[PDB]
């Protein structure tokens, strides 16, 4: 069933999400941080100016936050994403590839912030179920049946493709219009504890140099 | 030259200016320290040849 | 020569069409893996 | 008042070692995409 950390609050209370960045973020990571906020309906953007990690987690817990999102970059290119579940974990770290922001589209327009429909594809292994559990509870429970906004997490060889679309039910099918952003996200670390606790036990780690790392699939 | 540095260049008296000339022309005599006193085109052609071979791969 | 790691996946037009098919294809059947109030 | 001629190229374009660097970058850049 739903994990113990999520079992108490699964389908009872809506989540409270905090999205932040590393110290002295470049400009783009600021915009990219926003697009993550707009992706999660109950997310709020906070500036990490001189904030210290034990101070950040403790301050967020006091305010009642459910999850924290911290983002990293390299020359303004989003490189990593980490999600920490309060009060005692787990903490999942993610690596971003082929990131394409919505500011990077001309005349795109504004997002619809209705509670979105969710699709989780090709998640089979037990670890696959765990990561799905982590990602599912970022969003509100009970999206409206006629909600036009859909978010999909598609697992293709441990590279989860994230897409955002809006659909219109036609007389002879559906037509989906992508809103973005596009980015591929892969798990490489999962710890039983908050992100601050570097000594927290590791539930799972990605072995990158194992000879079968070339062809090993975990999700 | 034993010439005060705060002075302007206009004021200088004759003897000190002559001394300065002697200092410049005879540094070693007054103990001035000594310490104070195609291939690229070939590489370009080789890079072009590598580029052409690289095009040949494709 | 050998490689240690997976190559980063590439989003070709065919990949998008295959992905976009599944996104459309699901919606006919209304099969959305969603959290619901407990 | 003083009069001074303008400095310009008759046909503007929007040393050799420097060109070697740019052609390296273009030649450099292509190599990863094949390797990838």
């Amino acid at each position: 069933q739903v994990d113990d950390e999520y079992a108490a609050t699964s389908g009872i209370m809506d989540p409270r999400i905090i999205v932040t960045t590393s110290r002295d973020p470049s400009t783009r990571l600021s915009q990219f941080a926003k697009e993550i906020k707009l992706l999660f309906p109950n997310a709020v953007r906070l500036n990490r100016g001189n904030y210290v990690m034990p101070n950040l987690v403790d301050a967020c817990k006091k305010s009642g936050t459910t999850d924290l999102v911290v983002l990293h970059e390299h020359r303004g290119v989003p490189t990593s994403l980490t999600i920490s579940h309060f009060p005692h974990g787990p903490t999942a770290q993610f690596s971003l590839h082929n990131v394409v922001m919505r500011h990077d589209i001309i005349n795109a327009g504004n997002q619809s912030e209705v509670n979105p429909h969710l699709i989780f594809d090709n998640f089979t292994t037990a670890l696959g179920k765990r990561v799905v559990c982590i990602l599912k509870h970022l969003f509100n429970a009970g999206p409206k049946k006629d909600s036009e906004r859909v978010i999909t997490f598609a697992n293709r060889g441990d590279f989860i493709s994230v897409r955002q679309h809006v659909y219109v039910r036609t007389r002879e099918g559906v037509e989906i219009a992508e809103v973005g952003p596009r980015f591929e996200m892969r798990l490489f670390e999962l710890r039983l504890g908050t992100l601050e606790n570097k000594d927290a036990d590791v539930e799972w780690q990605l072995r990158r140099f194992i000879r079968t790392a070339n062809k090993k699939d975990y999700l | 030259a034993d010439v005060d540095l705060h002075k302007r260049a206009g004021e200088l008296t004759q003897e000190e200016l002559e001394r300065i000339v002697q200092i410049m022309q005879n540094p070693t005599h007054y103990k001035i320290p000594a310490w104070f006193l195609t291939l690229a085109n070939n590489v370009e052609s080789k890079l072009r040849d590598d580029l052409e071979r690289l095009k040949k791969i494709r | 020569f050998d490689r240690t790691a997976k190559p980063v996946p590439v989003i070709t037009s065919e990949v998008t069409e295959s992905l976009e098919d599944m996104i459309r294809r699901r919606i006919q059947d209304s099969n959305f893996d969603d959290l619901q109030r407990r | 008042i003083p009069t001074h001629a303008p400095k310009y190229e008759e046909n503007f374009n929007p040393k050799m070692k420097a060109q070697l660097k740019k052609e390296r970058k273009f030649t450099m850049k292509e190599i990863r995409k094949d390797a990838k």
Partner: peptide, 27 residues
């Protein structure tokens, strides 16, 4: 269907990396 895929509203230049790969595929 084709019109409403801006990544392939229109994107900034250089977003999509289709031209290289199809040319690599031909090779």
């Amino acid at each position: 269907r084709e019109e409403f895929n801006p990544f392939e509203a229109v994107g900034k230049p250089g977003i999509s990396k289709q031209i290289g790969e199809e040319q690599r595929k031909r090779a």
